[PDB]
RNA sequence: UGCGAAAGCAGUUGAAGACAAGUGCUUGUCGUUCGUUAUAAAUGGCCU
């Protein structure tokens, strides 16, 4: 369940978190590395943030937030940036999409799709008979 | 290593800090410390669970104010264990006060559930048929003491 | 009288049946009592529980839309 | 116990103290009459739940 | 300043952050200095959610600034505690109390973080990875907490016993950090 | 019509009164009333005959993160 | 039992004042009983005017040997407590709060009378051992 | 063990010792003597199960 | 809330101002006042 950071050039630890209660399934990250996303076993997404000024000159990442918004595992998750697009995508064994915004994670609205959407039928009905 | 055997006998300063070793708690106990109400009642209701300290953990729930939270998240499935204690547990003096107890808050947070399931249903005629013997033994007591206070 | 607050009187009926003591009682009344007494404890026990009552998916189904 | 108490009342009458020589009557059936009331309670909640799903 | 309604000074003496109603407004300025001069509304650093939710949520009944103004603590009646990051009014979300936090108090150099609460338990947040240590079981709930020493050698409590309701009887408590004990009750 | 989660229909020879995490779109995608929300999820929704509309619905352990209530 | 169902099932329309006789009829049985609360009472003012005009008539003399309005006012409460409580008069609050005073002051009673109907078992066995 | 006197308030002086056990003590400095015990590592029990070096 | 036994016996829960939200109207709120004896719900549980 840890978070932890490594200098690549001396490949050594600078941070250790114990964020979760079981397994870190999946990592992702903001353009600038402004904010590590974690999730896992226990359902829960954490933010880890760097972007406060006094920080990116220390390099200390904070344990910002976190928040519960799965039923079940979370196995993947992505994140996309653009200058209209800010989305943090979840995903795992409950089989829908929760959709975050990366900037405003810990205070923007969040959006579960359904689980099946009908784009191709797998149903039909006969009128006769 | 030759040193563990000194007590110090010859030195002017002896201090001790070491706190004496407690017994081991009990698992029941355990969850309680931690606040786990609900496992603390499965731990009450398992076989070979002395009488007496089955009868704490369901007083000291009690105590806590703990006797709806500790009933929640239940099925037929697990409430049977409780309901067969308390089958037993309504005999005895010691326990037909807190027996009473829990037993009503059940009914009135597993009205709906108990319809539908076929085997709560015997449970609770069983239970009925044991309530009301031990109705008939209270009177009787009832009656021998009325009876002793005419003699004296 | 009796077999003819009420607390009160049926407790001081219970002293009159002490201070006459075993010898005195005689059977045909004690049977009319006996019978009385009866009458009253199920009367009793039968407030009793009414005081306490005072206190106390389908797979398929058929349903017409709202149109 | 009632037959004891029926047969020799005469002599238990007559007896200095009853209280230390039958202390052990006096607490078992005190013991057993307190829990009517509470018993009482129970009974009544029983019947309501019983008589309701099996009218359903 | 007009129309206070909670305020607090940093444990050097020379920074005081308060909260007026020009809903409200926290401002921290420096005593003997020009150098600090801040000001912002409640509804920066208040959540979403917590707007969406009852009063409680904000509702501050606690308040701390750290010495170096970098940082400022925020207690509220929900049990959760929020740190914002005076320079570009970032939040960082505590949450461990189950019920109003009384008591906030930064340590002198910043990384740790004194809370009490009604839990009549201390907690002692390590700000770097977010951890905590326990001092439980006191003989009332925290009303205050302080690090009183140039190297905080000693902690000072004011513990309140709630149990009795005729009374507010206080007790004050010096705790050695050392090994957490008391050296003056 | 009807999507993933409401069934709807228009009357198409009437005229109607004329009284944030998606893409904002300022990019180019290339280079008599009746609605209802009681439903959901569907699978498919289609008619019997002329009055029998059939409506298809849908009907894992997980970790233990307790809600605690007092 | 049909007649005086119809019957009841008018006055209760009516607001006539003969329910408690229709009540007291001693037609009624335990089962009729039952299938008329539950298959008759459909609105709430037919089960608040049976409930005052039993809570009344219990109130006024809780030791009335006939046991057929008791039995009435179990079964009421047994069956639709959720709608009863539904009711927020606050006139049908001040009848149960008076029930409950007058119901109440017999529970009192059952421990004194265990102890008399005690006594007379002794004495009655007493006498039939003399007898012998 | 160690003598440890403070680089600014040289009237401190004091003793740390350890074993191998989980707790440090120290004697800072004679009817009596002020021995204060380190017991508490702040969340990293589990990196630290004894203090002997 | 008053009296009392623990049981109960009587009696309450009013008015103004302001803000927020939805659409001048509706509902909810008060680290605002006057007067009368007068559900909860930020995943949030206690050290060595």
């Keep these: 369940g840890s978070i932890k950071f490594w200098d690549f050039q001396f490949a050594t630890l600078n941070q250790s978190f114990k964020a979760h209660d079981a397994d870190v399934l999946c990592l992702t990250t903001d353009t ?30 904070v344990n910002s937030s976190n928040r519960l918004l799965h039923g079940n595992d979370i196995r993947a998750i992505c994140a996309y940036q653009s200058k209209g697009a800010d989305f943090l995508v979840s995903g795992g064994v409950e089989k829908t999409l929760v959709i975050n915004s990366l900037t405003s994670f810990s205070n923007g609205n969040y959006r579960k799709m359904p689980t099946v959407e009908p784009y191709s039928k797998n149903v039909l009905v006969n009128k006769e008979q | 290593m030759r040193g563990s055997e000194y007590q110090g006998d010859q030195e002017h300063i002896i ?81 037909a006060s807190i027996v009473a107890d829990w037993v009503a808050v059940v009914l009135e947070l597993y ?14 005629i069983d239970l009925k048929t044991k309530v009301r013997h031990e109705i008939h033994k209270s009177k009787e007591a009832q009656r021998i003491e009325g009876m002793l206070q005419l003699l004296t | 009288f009796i077999t003819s607050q009420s607390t009160q009187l049926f407790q001081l009926l219970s002293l009159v049946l002490d ?28 407030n009793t529980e009414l005081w306490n009552l005072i206190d106390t998916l389908p797979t398929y189904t058929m349903e017409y839309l709202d149109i | 116990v009632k037959w004891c108490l029926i047969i020799h009342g005469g002599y238990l009458v007559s007896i200095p103290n009853l209280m230390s020589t039958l202390s052990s009557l006096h607490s078992t059936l005190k013991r057993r009459s307190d829990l009517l009331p509470r018993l009482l309670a129970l009974d009544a909640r029983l019947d309501c739940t019983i008589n309701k799903f099996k009218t359903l | 300043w007009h129309n206070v309604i909670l305020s607090n000074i940093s444990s050097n003496g020379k920074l005081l952050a308060h909260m007026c109603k020009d809903h409200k407004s926290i401002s ?125 050698n000693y902690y000072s409590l004011i513990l309140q016993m709630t149990e009795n309701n005729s009374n507010s009887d206080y007790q004050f408590l010096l705790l050695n950090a050392s090994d957490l004990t008391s050296k003056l009750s | ?60 352990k997980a970790f233990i993160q307790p809600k605690l209530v007092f | 039992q049909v007649e005086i169902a119809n019957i009841l099932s008018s006055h209760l329309e009516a607001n006539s004042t003969e329910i408690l006789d229709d009540l007291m009829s001693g037609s009624w049985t335990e089962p009729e009983i039952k299938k008329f609360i539950l298959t008759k009472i459909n609105t709430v003012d037919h ?86 | 063990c ?52």
């Design chain 8, 2 to 53: 160690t003598f440890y006197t403070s680089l600014s308030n040289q009237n401190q002086q004091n003793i740390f010792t350890a074993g191998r056990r989980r707790y440090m003590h120290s004697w800072d400095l004679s009817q009596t003597a002020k021995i204060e015990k380190f017991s508490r590592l702040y969340g990293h029990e589990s990196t630290q199960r004894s203090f002997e070096n």
């Design chain 2, 111 to 124: 009205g709906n559930t108990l319809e539908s399931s076929p085997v709560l249903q015997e449970l609770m």
């Design chain 3, 19 to 46: 201070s006459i003591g075993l010898f005195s009682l005689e059977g045909a009344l004690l049977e009319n009592l006996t019978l009385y007494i009866d009458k009253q404890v199920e009367i009793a026990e039968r």
């Design chain 2, 15 to 95: 201090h001790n800090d070491k706190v004496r070793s407690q017994r081991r708690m009990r698992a029941f106990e355990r969850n309680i410390n931690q606040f786990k109400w609900s496992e603390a009642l499965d731990n009450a209701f398992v076989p070979g669970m002395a009488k007496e300290l089955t009868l704490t953990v369901l007083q000291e729930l009690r105590k806590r104010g703990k006797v709806r939270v500790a009933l929640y998240g239940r099925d037929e499935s697990t409430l049977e264990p409780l309901l067969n204690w308390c089958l037993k547990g309504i005999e005895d003096v010691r326990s």
């Design chain 7, 47 to 132: 089960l608040s005017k049976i409930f005052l005009t039993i809570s009344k008539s219990i109130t006024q003399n809780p030791w009335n040997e006939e046991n057929l309005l008791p039995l009435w006012l179990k079964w009421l409460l047994t069956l639709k407590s959720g709608e009863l409580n539904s009711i927020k008069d606050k006139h049908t609050k001040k009848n149960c709060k008076h029930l409950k005073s007058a119901l109440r002051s017999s529970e009192e009673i059952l421990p004194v009378l265990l102890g008399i109907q005690g006594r007379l078992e002794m004495l009655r066995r007493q006498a039939k051992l003399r007898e012998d």
């Design chain 6, 1 to 60: 019509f009807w999507g993933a989660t409401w069934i709807s229909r228009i009357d198409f020879d009437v005229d109607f009164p004329i009284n944030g995490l998606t893409i904002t779109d300022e990019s180019n995608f290339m280079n008599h009333f009746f609605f209802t929300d009681k439903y959901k999820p569907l699978l498919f929704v289609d008619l019997i005959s002329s009055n029998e509309l059939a409506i298809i619905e849908r009907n894992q």
């Design chain 5, 28 to 152: 921290v300025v420096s005593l003997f200095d020009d150098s600090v001069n801040l000001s912002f509304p409640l509804g920066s650093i208040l959540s979403s959610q917590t707007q969406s939710l009852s009063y409680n949520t904000r509702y501050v009944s606690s308040m701390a600034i750290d010495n170096m103004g970098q940082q400022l603590a925020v207690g509220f009646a929900s049990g959760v505690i929020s740190i914002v990051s005076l320079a570009d009014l970032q939040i960082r979300l505590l949450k461990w109390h189950i019920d109003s936090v009384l008591s906030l108090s930064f340590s002198h150099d910043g990384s740790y973080l004194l809370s009490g609460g009604w839990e009549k338990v201390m907690s002692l947040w390590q700000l770097e990875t977010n951890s905590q240590q326990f001092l439980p079981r006191l003989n009332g709930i925290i009303i205050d907490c302080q690090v009183l020493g140039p190297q905080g």
């Design chain 1, 32 to 61: 600038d590395n402004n904010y590590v996303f974690s999730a896992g076993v226990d359902r829960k997404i954490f933010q880890f943030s760097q972007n406060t000024n006094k920080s990116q000159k220390n390099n200390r990442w």
